[PDB]
Each structure stands twice: as structure tokens, then as C-alpha cells.
Amino acid sequence: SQAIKANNLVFLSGVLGLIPETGKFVSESVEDQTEQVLKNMGEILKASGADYSSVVKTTIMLADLADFKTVNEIYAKYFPAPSPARSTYQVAALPLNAKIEIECIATL
Amino acid sequence: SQAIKANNLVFLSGVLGLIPETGKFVSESVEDQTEQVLKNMGEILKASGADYSSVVKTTIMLADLADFKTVNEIYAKYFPAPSPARSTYQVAALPLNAKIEIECIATL
Amino acid sequence: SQAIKANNLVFLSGVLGLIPETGKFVSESVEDQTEQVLKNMGEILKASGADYSSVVKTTIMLADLADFKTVNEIYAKYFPAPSPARSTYQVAALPLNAKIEIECIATL
């Protein structure tokens, strides 16, 4: 599932930058894909009765770590300081050749 | 340790496709190794007083995302929909040159 | 943030082997960086009201899996058996070209 509730916590699946309706990427850019990832994540969090501010942990998996800065600049707009606990690294590849995938854990 | 209990949760280590008693891979194949990972994982879960059905989050680390389609269909037999929250990506390499590693978090 | 508290749990950000005050790597060695990661990690756990012995889950992201052995040696000194649940893999790259990143979850 996209999200699972356990007690105080909610666990979200790794989110790709897809249009919720179509299942296709919003574009090829890491910028649009990142933005879309954060938007989708917001939708899923709020559906679970959480929100951006109740997120306690995130993991950002990147296709290219060189995008780190711009990704971050987008990320910071959704998770401003104080931001959740975070880990970031470059993977060999992501599903559907995505540019970015973000997973997270939040409180209820 | 293979699993650590904390309140309502149990955290499992990343699991490779090894025959538990011998420490060796079931084969050099992703199919066999995935199936084995899921078996071992099951036994650890039930040893902790959990089970496949109480798993809230999983992470699948692959050596090759071409296997992702096969892996999925094996995975689906152990985690039928609605399945746990999940993240999947391809790493540079796994311990002991494994084809697949899976970690998870479950409820007690 | 470096650590987020949620009920019985605390979530730590991925930790690099940096001199905390200066933000610069302790060295370019994986050995020194591993040791430093673990120390910093201890600081962040203690400042949060937790400790090494209350850590329930770790994730070790390596730049080169050949370092595994020595890393695990160093790691073993900070998390002696019985040690936390753990996943380990090699990533394509880490932030600031680090040799090792370690994230963790502990109890309060």
C-alpha cells in the first residue's frame, strides 16, 4: 500500500514523481519530479491524517547526487527547519528510471 | 541481532538468501534467493512473535532492477495486497555479492 | 534536524564522519570516518536522552563494500553483541563523497 498506520506512526512507500491519475512522470527533470514527489507525499500523508509537519523521518534516494542542491532547495520548501531526520544517497538506479525517490515516516 | 523489539514494533536486519544453518546462498539465482529471503524473514518474524501480516514496512535492495519484475511476483505471494509500505531501488552491491536484500519493520 | 523524537522512539539523520564543529571530514580514511560517525552518533543519541545501548536499528551505507570487514570491526566496538538490527549495502555515492554514512533508530 501507499501508507500503513501502526499505532502513533504512519509509514509511507517510496514515492516517485508520477501524476497520481496517470501513473506517468510529470516530466524528466529532477526538479518537476522532486516537486511532484513532495506533493504526492503531502496527499498521502494528509489522507492518513498526518501532514508535512508531523513527518519524523525521510530518506531521499537519488539517481544523480549532483542534483542534491536543487532537490534540497525544493525539499526545504516543504520541510523547513526544523526538518525531519534525513538520509540521502545515490543509488545505482530507481524504478522506472526515476530521478528521485523519497520514503518517510510520520506521526498521527 | 536478527531482530530487535521496541514497544509495539520489531525491527529486522536486512535479510539475504542464505540457508540459515550453513550461511551459504540457496543458489546464484535471484528467484531462489528472493524466495529464501522471504522464508527466513518469515521465520524471524514468527520467532519475534510477529508474522508476514503484521509487517508494516519493507525495503528491497536489488543488484539489478531487471529482476524487479520477477522479485515483485515472488514478493506478492508472501505479501498480498494490501501489502506493507515499500521502497525499492538498485544498489551498487550487496554483502557477499547477493542478488537481493530485504529489511522490514513489523508490529507485535 | 539531527534527531526527531516520537513517543518511545528517536530517529537520527544519516551521519557522516565530520568534525561536528567544523563540518569537515576527520580524514579521507574509511577507518577514521567510521570511528567519527560512531562518536558523533553517540553525541546525538546522548543529547536526545538515548544511548548506544538503546539503539534498535541501524543502516550502514558504504561507498566501497570492500571496507566492510574493518568497518564492522570498528562498529563492533560501539555496538557489541547483541547488536542492533542492521542493513548494509554499497551505494553509488554518498554526500560530500563520504566513505560511510550511518543512520539509526533508538528508544527513549
Residue A2 pairs in a beta bridge with none
Our CA-based measurement puts residue C68 at a distance from the nearest CA of chain A, in whole angstroms, of: 18
**How far out from the chain centre does Cα C27 lie?**
16
Nearest chain A residue to C3 by CA: give it.
A85
Tell me how many degrees the CA angle B7-B10-B15 measures, rounded to the nearest 5. Answer: 165
Tell whether residue C86 is among the known ligand binding residues: yes
Query: What is the DSSP pairing of strand B100-107 with strand B9-15?
Result: antiparallel
For residue A82, what is its C-alpha cell? 526544523
Give which of B7, B3, B8, B32 is closest to B16, Cα–Cα: B32
**How far out from the chain centre does Cα B53 lie?**
14
For residue C35, what is its C-alpha cell? 570511528
CB–CB contact C92 A89 (8 Å): yes
Report helix, strand or coil for B93. strand
For residue C70, what is its C-alpha cell? 574493518
Number of Cβ within 10 Å of residue C101's Cβ equals 24
Give the span between the Cα atoms of C17 and C26, in whole angstroms: 6
Our CA-based measurement puts residue B87 at a distance from the nearest CA of chain C, in whole angstroms, of: 14
Give which of C43, C38, C46 is closest to C80, Cα–Cα: C38
Q: What is the stated resolution of the deposited model, in angstroms? A: 2.3
Give the span between the Cα atoms of B39 and C103, in whole angstroms: 27
DSSP single-letter state for residue C53: G
Which residues 48-87 on chain B approach chain A with CB closer than 8 angstroms? 56-57, 59, 65, 68, 81-87
CB–CB contact B6 C87 (8 Å): no
Report helix, strand or coil for A36. helix
Residue A1 pairs in a beta bridge with none
CB–CB contact A59 B87 (8 Å): yes
B88 touches chain C (CB under 8 A): no
Our CA-based measurement puts residue A77 at a distance from the nearest CA of chain B, in whole angstroms, of: 23
Task: Encode B26-52: b = buried (16+ Cβ within 10 Å), e = exposed.
Answer: beeebbebbbbbbbbbbebbeebebeb
- Chain B CB contacts of A3 below 8 Å: 85
Rounding to the nearest 10 degrees, give the CA dihedral for residues C8, C11, C17, C18.
-100
**CATH ID of B1-108, from 3.30.2270.10, 3.30.1330.40, 3.40.50.300, 1.10.3720.10:** 3.30.1330.40
> Structural domain boundaries of chain B?
1-108
Report helix, strand or coil for C20. coil
Can you list the positions of beta strands (E) in C1-108? 3-6, 9-15, 18-19, 24-25, 55-62, 85-90, 100-107
Give which of C70, C62, C65 is closest to C99, Cα–Cα: C62
Give the span between the Cα atoms of B12 and C93, in whole angstroms: 25
- Scan for cell 543502516, then name that residue: C59
Q: Which of C7, C11, C45 would you mutate first to test chain A, the one with the most A CBs within 10 A?
A: C11
Residue B100 pairs in a beta bridge with B62
Give the span between the Cα atoms of A92 and B90, in whole angstroms: 5
The dihedral sign for the CA sequence C71, C77, C78, C83: positive
